[PDB]
Design a binder for this molecule. Structure first.
Ligand SMILES: COc1ccc([C@H]2C[C@H]3c4c(nc5ccc(Br)cc5c4N2)CCN3C(C)=O)cc1Cl
Ligand SMILES: [Mg+2]
Ligand SMILES: [Zn+2]
Length: 285
């Protein structure tokens, strides 16, 4: 309750001051409270506080509870990863022109899902996992003092909840592989149409996965430090080769396809390539 005090009072700087619009954004320099201000700003400049009548102290308390339910002792799957998946989500919506293709509940749900998609992650040394993630997301969203969706109507609330659930489950890399063939097939032959409700949900699943792994598209010194955070989880509880395989099989074709839909999502495709080149050179010693 001490943390709520200093955050609920502080003035939330502009999105441009916080740089959360760059695809090339990083969070190392930021304290925990600074990531909270950036989170409020994301909600704010996505017109979410406006359209859904969010009270400032509920959002502050909701963010701090989401942060609380990540585990600082887990190397990579922590609030910083949740914060970053939400930031790239923001950068994709604004800097990537993607905002206009989605309804407000779709954007309000994508952002809530991005922030919550890994809640209570113990580390990979322990879609089962993602159902627990959504349950955590649901508990806090209904915890008293945190109900940021209270301004929503009943069928507004029902819709947002369903989209939140789909998106947290979408972060399952298994479901990504199952459904990405249809997304790639559709973009392959000018057949992609968002007005089809099915193609829209499929796209939301792809967009979540694109932000979930967006650390691979970062500037090399940041992506290298994140890849270090990843290794600390994996064995501390070779690397350049596994990185190229991960990029080859998982990341590249997705960011390729997202670049087709939004040519301003290209920094993610480009940054992923620049990291593949660096990882490929290293893999050869
Ligand atoms: C030696 O230690 C590693 C092992 C494997 C890897 C590969 C693959 C890896 C993996 C996963 N997420 C990532 C997110 C961001 C970045 Br940046 C790299 C990632 C990543 N890279 C999940 C899938 N996954 C698996 C199952 O192994 C990197 C490292 Cl350091
Ligand atoms: Mg997960
Ligand atoms: Zn994740």
């Amino acid at each position: 309750t001490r943390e709520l005090q200093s955050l609920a009072a502080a003035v939330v700087p502009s999105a441009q001051t916080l740089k959360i619009t760059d695809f090339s954004f990083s969070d190392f320099e930021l304290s925990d409270l600074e990531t909270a201000l950036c989170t409020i700003r994301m909600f704010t400049d996505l017109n979410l506080v406006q359209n859904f009548q969010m009270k400032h102290e509920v959002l502050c308390r909701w963010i701090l509870s989401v942060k609380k339910n990540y585990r600082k002792n887990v190397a990579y799957h922590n609030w910083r990863h949740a914060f970053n998946t939400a930031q790239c989500m923001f950068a994709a919506l604004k800097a990537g022109k993607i905002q206009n293709k989605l309804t407000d509940l779709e954007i309000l749900a994508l952002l809530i899902a991005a922030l919550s998609h890994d809640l209570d992650h113990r580390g990979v040394n322990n879609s089962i996992m993602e159902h627990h993630h959504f349950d955590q997301c649901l508990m806090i969203l209904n915890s008293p003092g945190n109900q940021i969706l209270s301004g929503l109507s009943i069928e507004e609330y029902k819709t947002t909840l369903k989209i939140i659930k789909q998106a947290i489950l979408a972060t399952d890399l298994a479901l990504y592989i199952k459904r990405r063939g249809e997304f790639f097939e559709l973009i392959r032959k000018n057949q992609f149409n968002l007005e089809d409700p099915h193609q829209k949900e499929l796209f939301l699943a792809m967009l979540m996965t694109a932000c979930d792994l967006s650390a691979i598209t970062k500037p090399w010194p940041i992506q290298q430090r994140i890849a270090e955070l990843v290794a600390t989880e994996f064995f501390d509880q070779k690397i350049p080769s596994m990185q190229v395989g991960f990029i080859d099989a998982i990341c590249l074709q997705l960011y390729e396809a997202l670049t087709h839909v939004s040519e301003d999502c290209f920094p993610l495709l480009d940054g992923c390539r620049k990291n593949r080149q660096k990882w490929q050179a290293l893999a050869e010693q």
